[PDB]
């Protein structure tokens, strides 16, 4: 939907994350500001060399390719817990004689 949610002055408001040392298990979150540890190094608390802080941002442009485009991804998930079901789907057609 790049025709509506972008401008030529820079749509870098949508941020992202490239890498981290650990592996996040699904169904939790982290807004943790954690320092990169390469090896024999202490923590300083400020950015610099080998303190690669992972606050990143994309490069959204309206003309930015046709395959490198913003895809608004909505992953809709369905759960059952052996319970009486509440969410019903679209029902059958109703006719009467």
């Amino acid at each position: 939907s790049n025709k509506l949610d972008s401008k030529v002055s820079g749509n870098y408001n949508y941020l992202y994350r490239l890498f981290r040392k650990s592996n996040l298990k699904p169904f939790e979150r982290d807004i943790s500001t954690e320092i990169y540890q390469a090896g024999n190094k202490p923590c300083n608390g400020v950015a610099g060399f080998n303190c690669y802080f992972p606050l990143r941002s994309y490069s959204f442009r309206p003309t930015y390719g046709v395959g490198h485009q913003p895809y608004r991804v909505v992953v809709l998930s369905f759960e059952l817990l052996h319970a009486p079901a509440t969410v019903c789907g679209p029902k059958k057609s109703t006719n009467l004689v």
């Binding site: 870098y12 490239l18 990143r56 390719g65 490198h68």
Partner: protein
């Protein structure tokens, strides 16, 4: 272990390159299309930060090593990271160097040659084509190099010693080794290449083409005597003012005076496209179907809607330069000063051919944002350009009627000007390679620099100056590619790379006819091999970049004679009524 953390800084530098360097290419995309006085200011503000942020990563580049890398994917990914440049010395002599290159550029841009006083405009090549009198053109000839040769002499070689000082800091022999030693290859036992072997590697490439050249150089001696009898030696050399160009690398203007048969010249495309209605918007659509029917992927949709193909007639200042713009990441754009002429049609597949090579390294990051080296970038742009003059495509498109049958001599005509444009240019350019490969070292002394470039011109090229001059001339420095920061060896390396690419052009589509009349279209099974060589890019060394193409990993110019196989057997019975050889004592000014 910091092997993956050294990997982490690579795509961390690209994410600050997809928004910093990509707009600086987009700002330069904006300027040569739209020239305003404020468009240059954010051009200069972005292009300086383009270098300075690349200098910002050069400060942290020397903190890591180079021999602690085992896997070959980061072996070439990291050598471009540690390329410092000339930043180790202070501002005592580097800041003075750009003040030399600007005053050498103002004399070449605002140069006037008069006592009929004209700029370095295309008109400079216009008196060289049409006018044939010498006395009205003698003052324009000697006064051309009287205002350039004396001028740029005491400023040129102070530009070379600065890079020869910094070459051994980059483990190079000279500034020529920055031009010639860029073909590094490391890896296994058969992968290791050292730098100083290309000098012998280029000698025997022309040893098999010199019997073709003197067969073609004695071809032109028969008929130019009918136009200038009292100037040219009979069985020897040639004066310097009848070359079709001031340096003799453009032998295209002289072609009405060296045509094989005067009964039928070459076929142009400017007469019949005015009848069917195919203007400048039409054949570019068939140029895209020529690019996607050979297995290569389709063009982007933004290439159709957001591109500027045709000259904007809204009072727009356009540079009118055919150039391919590599923006990257699907921002595939083009500008070309488009008309319907044949020279525009041969380059119609050139800069448009680069985008299909830009999608070869579209997967490749910013540090390796070129071809497999500096040589294969311009070769694949020209691998479809020399095949664009194939006559079987010109008959099938519908310009000539079907009853026009192409004779055996019809191929001989345009392959001659093809031979005079590149193959005739190699004896001028190959001596220019050993020009800078020996003046940069220092075996030739200070005050004999004039005659040795002429001594290479009497023996190899056979071109003698007709007026006597003094030692303080810089006629090899009269090219703006040679004088300023441009590589000229990429012009000759473009030939010998695509000369072997025309060999793999034959077995890819299962071709069996004459190799100069090649058309890769009407075949989709050719493309399954074409996606093998372009998918590797610069991530693999250049010793692997030749193996997947032909199968041999050596330089071979035997497919050049396979490219002109009807021209060699025809040429034997033409100029045998002459003596072959060279006389290095003839001079026109022996008064």
């Amino acid at each position: 272990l910091t092997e993956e953390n050294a990997k982490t800084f690579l795509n961390n530098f690209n994410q600050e390159a997809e928004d910093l360097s990509y707009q600086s290419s987009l700002a330069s995309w904006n300027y040569n299309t739209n020239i305003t006085e404020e468009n240059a200011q954010k051009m200069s503000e972005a292009a300086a930060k383009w270098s300075a942020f690349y200098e910002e990563q050069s400060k942290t580049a020397q903190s890591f090593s180079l021999q602690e890398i085992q896997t070959p994917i980061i072996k070439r990914q990291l050598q471009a990271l540690q390329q410092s440049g000339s930043s180790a010395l202070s501002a005592d002599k580097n800041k003075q160097l750009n003040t030399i290159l600007n005053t050498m550029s103002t004399i070449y841009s605002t140069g006037k040659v008069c006592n009929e006083c004209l700029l370095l405009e295309p008109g400079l090549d216009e008196i060289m084509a049409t006018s044939t009198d010498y006395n009205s053109r003698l003052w324009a000839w000697e006064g051309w190099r009287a205002e350039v040769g004396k001028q740029l002499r005491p400023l040129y070689e102070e530009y070379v010693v600065l890079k020869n000082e910094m070459a051994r800091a980059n483990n190079y022999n000279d500034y020529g080794d920055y031009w010639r030693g860029d073909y590094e290859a490391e890896g296994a036992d058969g992968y290791n290449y050292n730098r100083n072997q290309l000098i012998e590697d280029v000698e025997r490439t022309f040893a098999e083409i010199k019997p073709l050249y003197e067969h073609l150089h004695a071809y032109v001696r028969r008929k130019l005597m009918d136009t200038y009898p009292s100037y040219i030696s009979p069985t020897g050399c040639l004066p310097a003012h009848l070359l079709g160009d001031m340096w003799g690398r453009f032998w295209t203007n002289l072609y009405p005076l060296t045509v094989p048969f005067a009964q039928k010249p070459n076929i142009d495309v400017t007469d019949a496209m005015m009848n069917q209605g195919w203007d400048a918007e039409r054949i570019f659509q068939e140029a895209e179907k020529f690019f996607v029917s050979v297995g290569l992927p389709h063009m982007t949709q933004g290439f159709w809607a957001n591109s500027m193909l045709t000259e904007p007639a809204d009072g727009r200042k356009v540079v009118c330069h055919p150039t391919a713009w590599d923006l990257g990441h699907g921002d595939f754009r083009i500008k070309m000063c488009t008309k319907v002429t044949m020279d525009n049609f041969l380059t119609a597949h050139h800069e448009m051919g680069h985008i299909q090579y830009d999608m070869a390294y579209a997967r490749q990051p910013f540090l390796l944002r070129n071809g497999a080296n500096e040589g294969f970038h311009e070769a694949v742009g020209e691998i479809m350009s020399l095949s664009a003059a194939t006559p079987k495509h010109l008959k099938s498109i519908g310009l000539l009627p079907s009853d026009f049958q192409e004779d055996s001599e019809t191929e001989i005509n345009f392959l001659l000007k093809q031979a005079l444009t590149i193959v005739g240019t190699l004896p001028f350019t190959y001596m220019l390679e050993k020009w800078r490969w020996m003046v940069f070292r220092g075996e030739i002394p200070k005050e004999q620099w004039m005659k040795k470039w002429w001594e290479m011109k009497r023996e190899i090229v056979g071109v003698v100056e007709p007026l006597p001059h003094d030692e303080t001339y810089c006629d090899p420095a009269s090219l703006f590619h040679v004088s300023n920061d441009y590589s000229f060896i990429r012009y000759y390396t473009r030939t010998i790379y695509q000369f072997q690419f025309q060999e793999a052009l034959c077995q890819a589509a299962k071709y069996n006819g004459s190799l100069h009349k090649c058309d890769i279209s009407n075949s989709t099974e050719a493309g399954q091999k074409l996606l093998k060589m372009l998918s590797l890019g610069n991530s693999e060394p250049w010793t692997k970049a030749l193996e997947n193409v032909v199968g041999a990993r050596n330089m071979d110019v035997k497919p050049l004679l396979n490219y002109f196989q009807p021209l060699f057997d025809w040429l034997k019975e033409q100029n045998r009524n002459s003596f072959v050889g060279w006389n290095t004592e003839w001079s026109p000014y022996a008064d």
